[PDB]
């Protein structure tokens, strides 16, 4: 069959569990859910690895290293208005020079400068605060509390079955979201991958598959640690000491570390670049800085020494 | 000079801090974009018709957003309207957010120029036709309606029957809009003319 | 069940949302600080006058 | 001198803004003060001694 | 008695006595120092 296998309601089994129960196959070599019903139906070896559910998400966007993005908290038209006002004040001073009025005009200009710098400082502060007071989603509890961003898991998948028998706040929130909106659930992992690529969609599935696709993709990212323990055991015949023979054989393999090396033979090999924006900071980049280049503009006049 | 300098510094510092606090608090949250805004802010009263399908859906829904929305609307009876027309009128006249079936707000906005549809699609309920037991006609009307669906006729009927679409600004480039320096320009010109009056 | 009974008989009255930070038409919080500099100027003026 | 003036203004403004942002977010951040908080959340691990 | 949540002291501190390299990135201070150095000599060379 095209699935792991499960007993629905009649006491009948399908897939690897049925084959192992019938003992027409001696071991199940594949990822396989570990549930008490099938554990009683067929004995399972100790899992060759443990895993949970992870979150596939679209890569964050918004890297704009531009000088214009540094004077952003200011309408440029207002800035030119201030410049024209300042030059008008200067020319008024120059023409009038041919007293107390000069000082009072200087004082009012001082006050306007205070006002404008205060407004700029306040606006830039608000922009940076509202930027950094929010954070990218890192946990499924965040998914449960929010409703603006679509999210889902593969239907008829292992995560679905686990969450069916798991009732924690976020889990029934998830189930309510699934029931409410059937347009945020899929039947195949690739469909969910396409959903993530097209729309800002959160995907929940077995961690290993997400790790593989993230290490085989550069336009997606994985966020969040394990929210559950699943485990992938190995089937064994009824009353077989070979079950233990498997388990110890697995145990020394973990001690040997060959599973990690072979996993990186299959999983890793990715070359996704890294950015400094992952720690929620804008300090030390053209978003903060970049006007030192403007200093050279004044330097060209700084070399006129004679007529 | 030192004491006046400290006075000026502290007063301008207080002014700048208050300025920042104001714009932040207006800018720290969006005017309105989704029900999540109602989730995190409460300046706008929201509700629906009592015993309506919307509040029943909120009761049966386990979404913590709708859960807290129901808790709020139960907390304040002032957010409860006995009839949908009363809520429509109070929203049109005063600050109030009405939650109702999407096609109702669609038609109202088509038949209005001041109120607007707010929030994207949030529920999947739909409308169908009641069928008796042992009626193959239900199956026939099912397949016929499906045929009309790939025919797209329903769009034709809804556009024919629902068509009243009437007539925004961003103003986000500085604090409190572009219209913020006019007083500065006026006071500048007023101070400018004061220098020409006297000959000394 | 004792906790549930207490909550039933100590279910308070709802209160309006009041922890949201609000800042509007905030002045100098009634009194300012001009009095200190006014007093300092007055006290220094008398004995600079010597 | 004027462009240096503007640099100093903007840099001190940015410094004030980011430190104040840190202070404000620290003020709005609240730690756990009830088991209800653990019950509603899932991002913090907790346990008790069995038996 | 009832039950009590066990947790460490609230994590977070400031390395004494630095209180400006933590808010502002050090490279920003380095750039400011470089700019000050550069602008310093311009007036001296021009006036001379």
From Swiss-Prot, chain A:
UniProt-recorded name of the protein: Glutamate receptor ionotropic, kainate 3
Quaternary structure and interacting proteins, as annotated: Homotetramer, and heterotetramer with GRIK4 or GRIK5. Can form functional heteromeric receptors with GRIK2. Interacts with PRKCABP. Interacts with NETO2.
Family note: Belongs to the glutamate-gated ion channel (TC 1.A.10.1) family. GRIK3 subfamily.
Miscellaneous comment in the UniProt entry for this protein: The postsynaptic actions of Glu are mediated by a variety of receptors that are named according to their selective agonists. This receptor binds domoate > kainate >> L-glutamate = quisqualate >> AMPA = NMDA.
Gene it is expressed from: Grik3
UniProt modification remark: Mass spectrometry data suggest the protein is N-glycosylated at five distinct sites.
Extracellular side: 125-287
Main function: Ionotropic glutamate receptor that functions as a cation-permeable ligand-gated ion channel, gated by L-glutamate and the glutamatergic agonist kainic acid. Binding of the excitatory neurotransmitter L-glutamate induces a conformation change, leading to the opening of the cation channel, and thereby converts the chemical signal to an electrical impulse. The receptor then desensitizes rapidly and enters a transient inactive state, characterized by the presence of bound agonist.
Protein's organism: Rattus norvegicus
Tissues expressed in: Expressed in the olfactory bulb (at protein level). Expressed in the deep cortical layers, dentate gyrus, reticular thalamic nucleus, mammillary bodies, pons, and cerebellum of the adult.
Highest taxon listed in the record's lineage: Eukaryota
Transmembrane portions of the chain: 77-97, 104-124, 288-307
Glycosylation sites: 61, 64, 219
Subcellular localization(s) per the UniProt record: Cell membrane; Postsynaptic cell membrane
Binding-site residues for L-glutamate, renumbered to this chain: 31, 33, 38, 158-159, 206
Swiss-Prot record, chain B:
Domain of life: Eukaryota
Location(s), subcellular: Cell membrane; Postsynaptic cell membrane
Residues forming coiled coils: none
Expression (tissue specificity): Expressed in the olfactory bulb (at protein level). Expressed in the deep cortical layers, dentate gyrus, reticular thalamic nucleus, mammillary bodies, pons, and cerebellum of the adult.
PTM: Mass spectrometry data suggest the protein is N-glycosylated at five distinct sites.
Task of the protein: Ionotropic glutamate receptor that functions as a cation-permeable ligand-gated ion channel, gated by L-glutamate and the glutamatergic agonist kainic acid. Binding of the excitatory neurotransmitter L-glutamate induces a conformation change, leading to the opening of the cation channel, and thereby converts the chemical signal to an electrical impulse. The receptor then desensitizes rapidly and enters a transient inactive state, characterized by the presence of bound agonist.
Protein name, entry field: Glutamate receptor ionotropic, kainate 3
Originating organism: Rattus norvegicus (Rat)
Curated annotation (Swiss-Prot), chain E:
Organs and tissues of expression: Expressed in the olfactory bulb (at protein level). Expressed in the deep cortical layers, dentate gyrus, reticular thalamic nucleus, mammillary bodies, pons, and cerebellum of the adult.
Posttranslational mods: Mass spectrometry data suggest the protein is N-glycosylated at five distinct sites.
Compartments where found: Cell membrane; Postsynaptic cell membrane
Positions annotated as glycosylated: 11, 14
Ranges that cross the membrane: 27-47
Subunit and partners: Homotetramer, and heterotetramer with GRIK4 or GRIK5. Can form functional heteromeric receptors with GRIK2. Interacts with PRKCABP. Interacts with NETO2.
Role summary: Ionotropic glutamate receptor that functions as a cation-permeable ligand-gated ion channel, gated by L-glutamate and the glutamatergic agonist kainic acid. Binding of the excitatory neurotransmitter L-glutamate induces a conformation change, leading to the opening of the cation channel, and thereby converts the chemical signal to an electrical impulse. The receptor then desensitizes rapidly and enters a transient inactive state, characterized by the presence of bound agonist.
Additional remark text: The postsynaptic actions of Glu are mediated by a variety of receptors that are named according to their selective agonists. This receptor binds domoate > kainate >> L-glutamate = quisqualate >> AMPA = NMDA.
Annotated family: Belongs to the glutamate-gated ion channel (TC 1.A.10.1) family. GRIK3 subfamily.
The protein's name: Glutamate receptor ionotropic, kainate 3
Species of origin: Rattus norvegicus (Rat)
